[PDB]
Structure formats: C-alpha cells, structure tokens
C-alpha cells in the first residue's frame, strides 16, 4: 500500500506501475455478505472516474479465514466479485477490482481457487534462523553477537508450539523476542546479561498458566539461567515506559506490542491507577453505560479519542476489544507508513480506513478477564498483544497478604459485638458495620494504604504505619453508631477510645463542609487532581445547600454546581455540565455527583461510567494552575442496602462514609459526649 503509489512511488520500478488504493474490510465470524458487497461497491466507486490502466483499488479481507462458517454464509459473493465485480447488472469495466485475501486460518479452496493460494506453511528451523537473520539485518555486529541465541531460541519456540494444543503462541512471539533482544543488546553495546534474556523471554512468552516457558527457553540455554526473582509489576512498567535512549535514533523499528492485562473480578484498573500511572494520567476508552446511548456514536467517539491520544502522545487504557478490534486491528499490528519521519497507522470505522498519525510515545493497554480472553478472543489478537497477568497476587507481596488476612480478622471482630444494653441478639457481619464491605475489600484497602506511603522499605518501621493507615482506611468508611458501640465489641475498650478519638479529631466526619475545610487547607503530595467519593444515610443535597456552602466558602471554593444522575441520559449532558463547571475562572473548584441507590431507577450501574467520564474530562480540560475537587455522593439505606454496596474501589478514589451530609446545630457534633452524659444531665 505504501510502496506502489502511481507517481508518488519510492523507486523508478514502482512509478511505472499502477496506483494502489486499498479498502480494508476485516472479516469476523458474525460477518454479512452485505458488508463485503458494500466494500466492493466502495472500491469500485473509488475506481470510477480514473484510468483503469493506471489506478486500481484493492479490497482487503484481513481475516477471510474467520468468515467461512457463519450461519449467514458471508463469503459467497466473494467468488463473483472478482470476475465481474458487480451483481444484477450488465458486466462492464471499472467493476473489476484488485483483491488481497489475507487470513490467519486455512481457506476453502474451490470458491476461492481462481486466485492463487499462498498457503504459507509453518517454518522449519532453517527458515526460523533465516527470519532471525533478516530481522537482525538492520545492524551487523550486534546482529552476530546475538547470532548464537538464534539456533536455540527457535528450537525452544518449536517445543512450545509442540507442547500445547491451543495456539496461544506463534511467530509474532518469536519475532518480537528477537526484536527485544536486539533493542537491549544494541543499547548495552557490551553483550547480553542473563537478566536481559530472562526479561525478554518472560515478557514475550507470558500470560498462559500451564506453560513454564521461561524454564523451557532456559533449558535450551542453560547458561541463561536466572536465579533472582522476577515480578509482573516491573514487567508492566518496562512494557509501558521505554528507555531514555530508546526510540531516539534515526527511525524507530524496535518496539513492544500493545499490552494486555489479564485479571479477574475487573481489578486490574485499580492497581494500574494506584501504582503505575505517574506523571500523566491515562484516558479510559470504555463502553459508557449511560441509558439509551448509541453504541455506534459511542465507539466513533472512542476511536476519535484514541486517535487524538496518538496525535498527542498520551496513553490509552481500553476496556473493550469485542467492538474496538475491527477498528483497531491494523493499529495493533504496529507497522507504520512513514511520511516525513512520522508514523501513520491505519484507523478505520467500518469501511473507511485512513492513515492516522501516531506519536513516538503512545502506549495502548487492554484490560480483560481471563475467561473471556481464553474462550472468546479470536487467537491472533492474543499474539497481536503482549499478554501479562496482574490481578491481585502479583502486586500483593506475601507480607501484604498477611496484612489483608489480619485486617479481615480485625474487621470480623469489629463487627462481632455482644452488648446487653438492648435486649436483642442481632449478629453483625462486617458488611453491616463497614458500609461497602464485600469480602474482597481488605486487599483493596491494604493496597490503597501501601500506595499512600510509597516508601515500601521493610526496615521494621513501615509495617506498623501501613497497618495503622489501612486500619484508618477501614474505619474512615464505618457507620458512627457502631463506632460508639465499639465498647462491647471484641476489640475491647482502649481500642474503641483511640479509634473514636481519631474518628473525631484526626478524621473529620461531622460535616461535608467541615470535610472540605479540613482537606483544602493542607498541601497534598504533589497531586494536581484529587477526588473523593462519599457514602451517606442522610438526604442528598437539594440546591439550597450549594448557596450556603458558597457563602461559607468565599475564599476556598469556587461557586460549586450539583448534578444528579437521574437527569443524565447521555454522555454529553454530563460532558457539558462538567465543561461549564471547568470553564468558569477560579481555583479549587467543587463538583458533586449524586446517585441514590435506594429508588426506582436503574441509577446504580451508571456510577462507574459517570466516574470514568468525569476523570476523562478532568484530564482533558485541566490547565496547569487550577485545582479540581470532585465529590461523588451516594445515599444508602440503613435497612440493608448498606450491605449489598460493593465498597472500596481503587485508584484516585477514597471511600468515606459521612452519616450526615448537611449539618445539625441541634445535636452536638460529638456522640461520645452524649455517651458520657445522660438525658437528665442534659
């Protein structure tokens, strides 16, 4: 496509040939004959009005091996659309058109036998060494200082491709392994370390469970044995973050594939937001669930956003590849058509494929569940991406596992209270006491606490602080009545007093406005965007509370606005609301996003979409001097709706439970004093 342009070709040989224009129609198992028919119509239309001896269009069915056994039988009009090029008409010129039917699976011969099958076979060891030599043709002495590894590597890859029934691995893995050893060897200019080979082999061959691929590749290379440990978090960070010298020479031909994170319970986003995203925060390209939004418009805007991120140089975290793969498969291939030293990938929506620019530093992260990738991903998409596994235990080192177990015990004892004040034997689960507790929460909270510290040095000094901070996290979202009831709990007496003292002196839960006053004054940890989510049992803000908050906030807040999830039927209503909230001048803004889980509406699965959209807007509208404050507020019911609430999410979100939203002058803002005093002494 890039080479044989009519007069804009790169060599005299290609200038004398025809001018190519390709339209790419990727085939899927759920394809339609009308799709390929329309693609052929489009290429014929492009052909019309040109010279048939100098201009040709070419239909490209990228995965014609997938559409062979659809119930609708899509690959039927392909056979005639190559001889006459049209249907129900007199055959005529400009209807014939070129064609390249690329496929990753074997084809049905006969109805495609007018063309010539290049049934490329599995390469032998000879062609594997030859391909390695060709890939390393770029440089020469660093080519032959990694030449020795060529023979064993291929052999090892062979055994892998022999030892598994499912084709989880292919020649992409072997090629990219050669490429990474290239890049690291030519950066080193001194040779190759065992850590180098082990990192390359593990990073490229990973993801699958029943493969000791590193052990197999170190069997063929026993000298390249690594006795030190290797973790997945560093693997992710060196997949995403490249080296300072890398991609800085003339042209960039050595680079990793776009990363995938395999996880269960959709937890990858949490740690990915907590520990990895530093400096610049990525944009989440996800399937917005605002009611009756259009999927086509949503994916069109999603692809527009990813294209803008390519043009700018900002990382994209996709959450959807069952609909953003027909529109991104060529960009995942990561092969560029250079024009003035700038990389242009193919981006297309349906039948309209164009070359969109890609920045030097643009990384794409897919996030997917293990089951769905292992039984619904097409398989070439697996080889197309760099599989990794970071779910909960790759980032949770064993002492943090001890911490989560200890915290779950302490939570079960915090909930385990036996009191004789009232004549009632009501057992309390940690779900009832800690609002938003779902038996996977303690790992989340210990993750949050260790990220709040960040030192991560075990010198007997940090374990105490991480335990205390995770305890503070779990208390920070607990109902106040149980905090008072702590007296008769298994946690004893002094624990109750110290917990309540921190609950009223170091932690401010008396007022939403008091929470703001206590937070905004102090300087943060060099963070230019901070958001907090709030759980309440009281009534949501009505509209007269924003005015009083503004009056009390003549110097710290910036005339806030309050939005309700019930009124928002689209992404764009939210977009224009946050945009009007951000376009106004002044620093330290305040926004409240309200959603009531106790009502007759479906406004419970919109919380994630609303949060993601808000974060996207914050990261695409913020300057460098204005600070932002978003307070998502959800109201729960004490009659049992505080137990079904899935709790402490990760990232730039800190769940706090404020029982009273507005204020109360009648009651004193310290229930421990009311515990001390009796009604008579009042």
């Amino acid at each position: 496509a890039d080479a044989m342009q009519g007069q804009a070709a790169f060599s005299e040989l290609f200038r004398c040939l025809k001018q190519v224009h390709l339209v790419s129609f990727q085939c899927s198992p759920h394809s339609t004959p009308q799709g390929i028919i329309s693609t052929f119509k489009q290429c014929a239309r492009f052909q019309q009005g040109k010279d048939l001896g100098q201009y040709v269009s070419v239909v490209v069915l990228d995965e014609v091996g997938l559409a062979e056994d659809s119930p609708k039988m899509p690959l039927k009009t392909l056979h005639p659309l190559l001889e006459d090029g049209c249907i129900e008409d007199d055959p005529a010129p400009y209807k014939k058109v070129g064609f390249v039917g690329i496929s990753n699976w074997a084809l049905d011969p006969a109805k495609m036998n007018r063309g010539i099958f290049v049934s490329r076979g599995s390469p032998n060891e000879k062609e594997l060494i030859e391909s390695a030599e060709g890939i390393c043709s770029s440089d020469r002495l660093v080519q032959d200082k990694i030449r020795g590894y060529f023979a064993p590597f291929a052999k090892a890859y062979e055994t892998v491709c022999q030892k598994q029934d499912k084709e989880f691995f292919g020649l992409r893995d072997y090629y990219s392994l050669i490429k990474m050893v290239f890049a690291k060897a030519k950066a080193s200019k001194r040779g190759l370390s065992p850590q180098d080979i082990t990192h390359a082999v593990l990073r490229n061959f990973s993801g699958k469970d029943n493969i000791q691929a590193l052990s197999i590749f170190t069997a063929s290379l026993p000298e390249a044995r690594y006795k030190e440990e290797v973790s997945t978090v560093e693997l992710i960070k060196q997949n995403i973050y490249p080296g300072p010298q890398a991609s800085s020479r003339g042209l960039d031909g050595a680079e990793s594939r776009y990363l995938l994170v395999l996880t269960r319970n959709y937890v990858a986003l949490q740690i990915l937001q907590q520990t990895f995203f530093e400096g610049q925060q990525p944009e989440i390209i996800f399937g917005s669930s605002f009611p009756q939004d259009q999927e086509y418009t949503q994916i069109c805007r999603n692809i527009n956003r990813v294209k803008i991120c390519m043009e700018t140089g900002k990382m994209v975290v996709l959450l959807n590849l069952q609909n953003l793969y027909e529109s991104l498969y060529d960009a995942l291939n990561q092969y560029y058509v250079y024009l003035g030293g700038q990389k242009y990938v193919d981006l297309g929506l349906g039948t309209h494929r164009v070359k969109c620019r890609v920045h030097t530093a643009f990384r794409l992260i897919v996030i997917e569940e293990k089951d769905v990738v292992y039984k619904q991903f097409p398989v070439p998409l697996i080889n197309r991406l760099e599989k990794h596994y970071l779910d909960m235990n790759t980032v949770l080192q064993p002492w943090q596992k001890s911490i989560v177990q200890e915290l779950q015990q302490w939570a079960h004892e915090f909930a385990d209270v036996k009191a004789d004040q009232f004549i009632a034997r009501h057992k309390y689960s940690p779900a009832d006491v800690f609002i938003g507790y779902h038996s996977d929460a303690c790992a989340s909270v210990v993750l949050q606490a260790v990220e709040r510290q960040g030192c991560r040095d075990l010198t007997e000094e940090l374990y105490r602080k991480v335990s205390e901070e995770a305890r503070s996290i779990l208390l920070d979202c607990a109902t106040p009545d149980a905090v008072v009831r702590l007296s008769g709990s298994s946690l004893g007496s002094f624990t109750a007093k110290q917990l309540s003292q921190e609950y009223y002196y170091a932690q401010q839960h008396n007022s939403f406005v008091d929470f703001l006053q206590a937070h905004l004054r102090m300087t943060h940890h060099e963070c230019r965007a901070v958001f907090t989510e709030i759980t309440t049992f009281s009534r949501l803000l009505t509209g007269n509370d924003c005015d009083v908050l503004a009056s009390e906030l003549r110097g710290l807040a910036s005339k806030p606005v309050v939005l309700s999830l019930q009124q928002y039927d689209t992404e764009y209503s939210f977009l224009k609301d946050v945009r009007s909230w951000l376009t106004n001048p002044g620093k330290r803004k305040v926004l409240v996003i309200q959603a009531d889980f106790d009502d007759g509406t479906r406004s419970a699965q919109l919380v994630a979409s609303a949060k993601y959209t808000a974060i996207n807007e914050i990261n695409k509208t913020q300057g460098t001097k204005d600070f932002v404050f978003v307070y998502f507020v959800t109201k729960l019911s004490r009659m049992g709706s505080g137990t079904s609430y899935v709790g402490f999410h990760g990232g730039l979100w800190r769940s706090v439970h404020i029982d009273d939203l507005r204020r109360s002058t009648i009651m004193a803002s310290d229930v421990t004093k009311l515990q001390n005093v009796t009604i008579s002494q009042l």
Partner: protein, 1063 residues
Amino acid sequence: KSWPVHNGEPVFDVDEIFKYLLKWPDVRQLFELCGTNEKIIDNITEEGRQLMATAESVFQKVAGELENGTIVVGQLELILEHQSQFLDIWNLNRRRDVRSLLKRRRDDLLFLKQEKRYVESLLRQLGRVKHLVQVDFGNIEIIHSQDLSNKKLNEAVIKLSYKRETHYCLSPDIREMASKLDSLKDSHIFQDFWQETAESLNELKVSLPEVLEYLYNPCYDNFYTLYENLKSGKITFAEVDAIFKDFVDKYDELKNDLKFMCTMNPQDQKGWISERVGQIKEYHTLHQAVSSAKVILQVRRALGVTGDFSVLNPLLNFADSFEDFGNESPQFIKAKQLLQDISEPRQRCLEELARQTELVAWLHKALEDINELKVFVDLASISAGENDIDVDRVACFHDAVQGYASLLYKMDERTNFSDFMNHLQELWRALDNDQHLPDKLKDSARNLEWLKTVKESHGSVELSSLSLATAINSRGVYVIEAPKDGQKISPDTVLRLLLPDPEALRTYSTEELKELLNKLMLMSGKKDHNSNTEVEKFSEVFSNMQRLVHVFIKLHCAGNMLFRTWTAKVYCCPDGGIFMNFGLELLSQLTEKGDVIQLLGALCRQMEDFLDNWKTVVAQKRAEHFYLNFYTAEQLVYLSSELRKPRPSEAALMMLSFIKGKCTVQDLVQATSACESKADRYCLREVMKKLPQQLLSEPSLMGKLQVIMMQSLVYMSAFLPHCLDLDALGRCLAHLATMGGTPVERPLPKGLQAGQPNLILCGHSEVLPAALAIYMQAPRQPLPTFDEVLLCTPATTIEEVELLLRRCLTSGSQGHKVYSLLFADQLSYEVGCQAEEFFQSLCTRAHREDYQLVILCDAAREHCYIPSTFSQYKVPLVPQAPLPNIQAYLQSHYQVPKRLLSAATVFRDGLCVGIVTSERAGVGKSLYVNTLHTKLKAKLRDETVPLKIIRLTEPHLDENQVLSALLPFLKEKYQKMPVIFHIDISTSVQTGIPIFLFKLLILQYLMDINGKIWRRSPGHLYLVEIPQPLFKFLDLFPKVTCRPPKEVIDMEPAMDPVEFCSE
C-alpha cells in the same frame, strides 16, 4: 507459624524444607539458642519438637549428601548462594576442617560451570551453520539437553588431576577448541570466517573429530594469518572493504572487538589499536566523500546550473583507479581538511536533493522567489485532502522548502569554496532541528503530480469534510417522515437530512451521514477549537436525532396509530427551532426555537416516558379485552387503521377470521356500530374544545407536548378520528367473538392438570405427534391455529410468546382451550428468561384458574433456560396416540365438506392437503401435481384456475419467502374459485421442513410479526413436495407417493395420458 504453608501443611518432599532452613534468618538463631543450652529444647511443645525433628533430619540428610557425591547440584547451588548461613549452621551443628572443603567445592563448581559454558558455546558454534553441515555431537546432544536435576556423583572428580564429567569430550583437544570458541564467541570477523570455511564443504554428516580438522583448523589458520597481517599492518584495502564493510561509524564496538582479538594471543596492546582504527575511519570517510562528491557532480550535470567547483577532479581521478597498499600520503591531508569532521549522516540529505533534479527545477520554474511560499501553502491547503496524510502533505512541503531554501535559493552560478562551506554549515545548523527533513523533501517531491495540479487547478467539486459539517450546522434540517411508500420502516429509511444552498437540494441518508461521521472523526485536527466544537455539535445533534429515530420506530413498532404520520423538521442552526407536525386537519404545528441539543434531549425524554406509559396502557387494555391479545402491536395498528374505513382491506378481514371465522364486511360494520355510544362523542368534543386553551397555558413546547401526549394517552379517539383506539378495538374484537357461535372445547389428557402448566419431554422426533395426541382427544372439532399453538423456533420474538401466555391467562374468552408451546427449548436464553418473568408477572396479577397450558420440549435439550427452570411442573407421561389414529384424525379433519366448490374435489375424496414424495427423485412428483391439475380442469369447465409454484431452495428454510409469494394471491376474493397451489422444495432445506409444514398445513397459518396473516383456506388445494428425521414426520399428512418404473412393475398405473399421447 513459620512453616511453608502451601494451602495447609503439605510437604511430601525435602527440597522446600531445605530452602526454608537456608533462607529464613531466624531458624539460624533458633537452632543456635536451642543448642547453646538444652534447658530450652526440653520444653517447647509436642508438635513443634516433631517439626524441629523433621527439619533436623532433612538437614542431616543433605549434610550427609554433601560429603559424598550424591548431593544434587540444585541444592549445591542453593548452598553456594547461602554460603554464610550454611557455614554458620554447619559450625553450630558440628557440636551435634570445613573452609578447605568449601573452597575446593567452589573451585570444582567453577570448573563444572565453565565446562558447561564451554560445551554450550561449542554447540552454538556447530549449530549456527547447521543448514550447511550437520553434526552428530556424540552423546552431549542429549546430555546437555537434560535439566540440572541429575546427580552430582557423575562428575567423577578423581586424582592421578583430570576431572571427567558427564559431557564425554573426545579429547582435551576438543575441550581446548571449545574453550577458544568461547573466548572468541563474540567477534563478527570470526563469524564471517566460520561461515566462509563452512561454505567450503559443499548434506554431509560430519562428526566432531573431522569437524576439528575440516572446519575449525582452516578457520584458525586463516584467523592467525589475518591477525599477523593486522599486527604487521601489511593488509590491503580490498580485503578491508570486503570484510570491515559492516563497521561503518561504529568504532567503540570495533575497538572492543580488536581488544578481544588481542586477548586471543597473550601479548600487549598499547600502540596498535588507535592508529589502525583511525586509518579504518579515514578510509571510510574518504569513500563517503567520494560518494558525496559523485552525487554533487550528478546534481551539477542534471539540475541545470553549470557552476564551477574545479576542486574534486583529482579525487574523481583517484576514484576510478585502484591502488594496493594499507598505509596512510600526507599531500592529501590539507585538501581533506575542509571535510575533516563533516558527519556520517546528512549525506542522505544532499543526495536526496541531488537525485531529485525535477523538484528543484520545477520550483525555480514556478515559484522564482521565497515570498510566494506563504500564499502558496494556503492555496495548496484547500486543494489538498481531508485526512491526515493529505493534510500533512502541505506541512511536509512547507518544512522541506523552509529547510532547503538556504542551498536552493541563496546560490550563485559562480561560488567560492569558503562561502559554499559557510552556506552548507548554516544548512546543517537548520537541518539539526528536523533530522527527518530529507524524508520530507523526498515525500514532497514524489507528490509532483498533485503539486503541478495545484497552480493550474480549476474549480474542484469537493466541498470538504468539515465545511460540510459547517453546512449541516448552518442550515441542516433533520427530517423524520416515516415514509408511506412501499419501502420498509428501518431506522435508515425514516430519517433524512436536507441541505439547501441557487435552489438545488441534496438529501443525505443515515447511511451517508454515518459515512461522513466516520470520515470526520478521523480527519485531521487544526489545533483550533472551532473545528472540534462544530464537529462535536454536529455529532451530538445527529446522536440525539438517531435516538429520536430509535424511539420513534420503537413507538411505531410498539404501535401508536398516532405517530404513523408524525413528521419533524429539526433546524440544527442556532435558535433555528424544532418544527413538528401530525398528519391531521385538527392539530396545529408545534414549533419552538432556542438551543436544539438540550431541548431535543428533553423531547426524547418525554417521548420515552410516553412510550413507557403507552406500553403500560396497552398491557392494561390487552389484559382487559383479551382479544387485542391475538395480534402483536403491528397487526393491531394495521387492524385499527383499516377498521375505520368503510371497506377494510382483505388482509384485515383474513386476519380477523382468526377471532370470528368466515369474517365479512357486513358483520364487521354491524359490530363496529355497537362499540361506541354518544357519550364517547360528547367526551371527544369536550376534549377538542378544552384542548387549545390548555395548550396556550405553557410557553415552552415541553409542557405543551407533555399535555398533548397525556391527552392522546387517555383520550386517543379525539386525536386521530380515522383509526380506532385500543379500547374501541377491544370492543369490536370482543363483540365479533361473541357473535361467533359454537365455542371450541378441548379437554386435557389424563395425568395433565388443567390448573398447573404441564411440561413434557418427548424428543425431537415425537414433539409434533405427541402434541397432536393432545389435540385429538376432542375429535370432530376444527384444528387449532397460531393461537393456542406456538411452534416455537430459534430467535422467536418475545412479544409472540408473551401474547400466547396472555391469551392463555385472561378470564374473558368464552371457551376452555389447550395452549401448547411446542419446541420451547430452541427459544433463546433472553427470550426464555423474559417469557418466564412475564408468566410469573401475569400469574401474579390475575387470570382464570382453569388454563390448560402444555409445554412440549426436546427431551435431549433440557439444559436451556425454560426447561431447567420448569423442572418442578413436569408430567412424566409423554402422551402419545398410535400413528394410524393421527393419520385418520388429520385426514378426516382435512376433508373439505361437500357443496363447497373446492379444488380438493380433484384429490382423494377432498383432503385439500397432500404430500407427493419419492425416496429417489426424478419420478413424477411434479408430473403427478400437473395431472391432478388437468384432472381438475376436466371438471369445473371454464377453469381459469391459477397454479402458484413457490420454489423453496434455500438453507435454513424461511417462512417470509413463502408468505411473500402467497401474499398477492388471495387478497382479492376473485380467485376464491378453486385454486391449486404447488409448494416445491429443494434438497438443501434440511433444517426447516417440519416446523414449516406443521405451521402451514396443521396450524393453517403463516404470519409476519410486523405484517399481515395468511390463513390456509379450507377449500383451496395444496400440494407440497418433499425430498427424502423427516421420514417419520412425513407420514402424518395424507401422502401419495410415486416410485420408479422398476419398483412399480412388480406390485402393480404409473403412466400418464399426456406424455404418451405426445409424439
């Protein structure tokens, strides 16, 4: 608590425990404290002491293995990693020389691992050229492959000195050659030497003893001779540019490779590497200068300017000649001084400028100055494209000329070397801020066609991808019409976009709008807020308009009979306004200006709320009348629209024949005259009077639309005085039903209860007959129809099964009926789930507690949703009647009675349905049909009988094709004179035959869920062919078969007058 828990105390081995003792820094102190004083070991526990004993025994075993050779190598390397801890623990346990033992052990392990590396290197060298020569590596090819879990004792450390290992090397000579291949493993020149000696052999199985002589030895002798030649410096440049060609401007690694060279022979390296590498660099730079000067002479010859250099002529004279010496000679250094440190890159820059003499000549011919570029780029921008490559074409051109105008526009035909060097220096300075500039120049030069068609460009008919968005924003009118032509009602054919200017008009469709949408989310960005605001506004207005189309078709297909003629012309222009209209003479136009986006969203809010309340009220009306529960929404709309007309269409009457039977227009008008009193007319008049006064009460269109939709919801007949509302529809249908006498009465079989649903599992081959066993327990009654019998298929609409359940469970019906849901298992997961929820809700609200609901399912398909959730209400009988009973029942119920004037008189005593078949084809099936046709022509003189012949030839046999072929045949009443149909079927139809046959012949119906209904007429003949699972099912219908002559010449005629009478 420190034991290595592995899901709860599993060990079953000894290596993990050894690792635990070695790595944990507290086992050391615990053991030392226990051993210092025995007054602590006596009081620990009963299990702690046993685990301590187990750990002690493991450590004793490994320590005993250490003294002899049986200690595994892996644990040995663990000890070599935790030397300190193991030494301390061993010293502690000595109480119940070691430094010399440990040092000797580390020395011998170093020897073992260095031999391991040596044999690995040997294997690498001998497998690098594997495609040329193949080697049998004695036994090491399998001994090296096995992992290092083998026993140590095989290392045979013996004295009387030599240490033989499991790698059986043939001789110390091969060990030394492997060691030297390890020491020279990292030389490119060594790699080339190895390859060139390996190619001197040729498919030859060559063993190590002759590998050492045939392959290694010539390579080493050549290597030694080359090393001596390099030490002397007597080499020639032919060999130099032959071999060092892969060392261009990468000299640190070259210096390290020469250091590896000089480490092979152990002598000093002080004053040889620097000058020799400098000589190589000087030779390379001289060759580069020769190439660059050749390119400069090429551009001087070809570009057009003659110039005058007269300085590189001796260099060119030297270039064409060949000299053989390796030394430096000094007379050229001063001449070379001017380009001492030019660069390794950027000669690509001048050579790309030089090899393109057409671009510079054309730029001087066309531009002639530097001031015209700023206008020229703007003129080229409009002529350029819309996508990223096309937009960046002009940018790369502009940057290329900006970076090349220094040596392109500031030159004289007579130049002096000094000023040329200064200009080139400034050129390099300018290029340093864009190192891809030569690529930009080449990419602009190759677009010479687009770039010559830019100045001479005429009026180009290509508006834009963004100025077109400007046009949509300025004057685009989104027009919803719901067209009333013969086309369909898909969300593509109901929305249009008219774009005015002159007075020509262009009409974008939703497909073309989508294509432009894809086009302009992928178009370039000018970093200007106007483009992206405008495109965002267009995308949002189109998204809300698409959702309005979504809701509008949702409401139409859900059936509103008031939005059939609804139309809307949204003016996307700021404060343009949204203009609605209803297809009526009594409802005014509704227009409101202002912002289109928010108000359109609010309008869609009210539209969806009205849709919800409409579904609620239609559900209530169906739950009341029970006869709006024979047609889904589209058929209800068709009936309501075609009922108010004085003559309803024949389609509507044939549909209504399912409620009444033998329906007539006279009965229809007689019923519709008694379905409304004058009180209803008074109510509608009062609504008409009050309506405009309440409309004038709200300024915005939101409130007026809300009030108008609430009034249409409650009192609809006033709004649309040409279509019956659901209430009048229900009264008409109920009155027609009561007028139809002799209600049917079908009793349930034995063991199936008439108050609880009855799930039956029969198997795919018996579902159709078993269901029949349910329905012939009441003989001498008309057959069932699509009501009370749902022949369920994959992907059947939830509305149809909901309708079936509704007609099962509404009290007012005038007759007990058995409602069979056949093949309930092939329903989709979601369809079945919604059907189950609907059944639960409809039995929760209210019903009659005497419904006979039966659910027949595939016995082998119990895994799906409906049967798995229906396990409790299962009847374990599987009812079935004998096959001849089914045959006689269907035959005697297919009998068209006398004095009916039917086509079936030509059949065997008037069955009116027949199957003609043969086990092998080409026998006379169609001939039999045609002979029946001509036999009917023999009777009923003045025949003019038509013969429709539907050819069913497709896989996954589909109902709508046959229904469409049937539709224009009997909606006219003039062909009610006896008609012979002819259904013909192919042999690629394996997956649709039985359901279709039962539907058409037994159920006597074929229905489009969004269309009219065909009823098989009792009096018009049918003849369905069939090819030859289906073998048993085919037998139920009255079947007449024909067999080939050799099969009909022994038992029996098989002849026809027509074929024999022909000549």
